[PDB]
Design a protein around this ligand. Structure first.
Ligand SMILES: [Co+2]
Ligand SMILES: [Co+2]
Lengths: 194, 196
């Protein structure tokens, strides 16, 4: 089966950054990526997420609000995921700490679901900090895990005709046992989502 | 089954360097490691491999093993902390170069059961990327549908000392064709028993 992600070789040349292709699990496609966000961009995304400052307009986790930094990153992400940024839900920030985990789940919606009309097709999780211990992104049906490393990311997609491959993208966030974990997530839909 | 590699969490703290645990495939265990070698250490290993000058000692495939010196000793000590086996079990740093239009055919690193070389068989491998490969050069595991792409200073660890031998045969691996540039790796093979 063809994949949405189609980058060959060892790097993805985006407009403002060279992304490193680190490892690939082929089907379903799970790709570890390096050099996705700079260290300062990582710090700024956390700082933005904790802040209650917003721009004025006339008239767990949370999606960030658009600014010049966040638009730059969605543009970069769009190159990586081969789908226009208009299809992304925006930079969602999640933070979990010691004695917490994110239970395993699929990122897409059920066929009987209402949001299945314009269902999610692919995911990028960006590690915004270094986790002292724990906090892996794990795929329990694949026996595969990606450990948080600041500036790196895991891409995976679930848009296959054989929906068995799609159910293999079940994933979770492992317990943090030392420190804390901050991730940015971009969920991409099959159609324009705005 | 229990693995030789026994590091929880996200870093390995060795005597001189903090190694990053990047990704794991759990069984057979295949671990992508970051920050294993400095950029300068990578360059030095390549240049040492290029030289045919060698020390002489009383009494006397592809790629070549490096002579023991301060650099190789330092690196073997670090690797022994990663691999959880004394460096005395290591064969020493083996350097391989292949260029555009070349590949390394899929194989097992361990020796066939009951073979003379299986008497002190290999149990684990660390492959260190010494340069960036313009395109191609992945370390691929065809039975697992998994590949690790070369990235200077990074490494892939894997082991094949399982009691269920089928797990060991899942570590079949090769070096994919380089389609642009060239590829340099160092490898440490580790034996069940003392080797040096
Ligand atoms: Co998820
Ligand atoms: Co090999």
């Amino acid at each position: 089966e063809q994949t949405i992600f189609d980058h060959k070789g060892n790097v993805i040349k985006t407009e403002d950054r060279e992304i490193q292709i680190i490892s690939k699990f082929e089907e379903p496609l799970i790709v570890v990526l390096g050099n996705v966000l700079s260290d300062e961009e990582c710090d700024e995304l956390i700082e933005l997420s904790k802040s209650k400052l917003a721009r004025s307009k006339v008239g767990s986790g949370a999606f960030l609000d658009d600014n010049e930094l966040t638009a730059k990153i969605e543009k970069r992400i769009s190159s990586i995921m081969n789908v226009p940024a208009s299809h992304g839900e925006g930079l969602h920030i999640l933070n979990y700490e010691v004695d917490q985990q994110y239970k395993a789940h699929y990122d897409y919606f059920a066929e009987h679901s209402r949001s299945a009309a314009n269902n999610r097709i692919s995911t990028l999780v960006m590690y915004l900090n270094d986790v002292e211990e724990g906090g892996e992104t794990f795929f329990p049906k694949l026996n595969l895990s990606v450990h948080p490393r600041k500036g790196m990311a895991v891409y995976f997609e679930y848009f296959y005709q054989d929906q068995s491959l799609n159910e293999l993208t079940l994933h979770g966030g492992a317990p943090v046992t030392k420190g804390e974990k901050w991730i940015a997530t971009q969920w991409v839909r099959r159609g324009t989502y705005k």
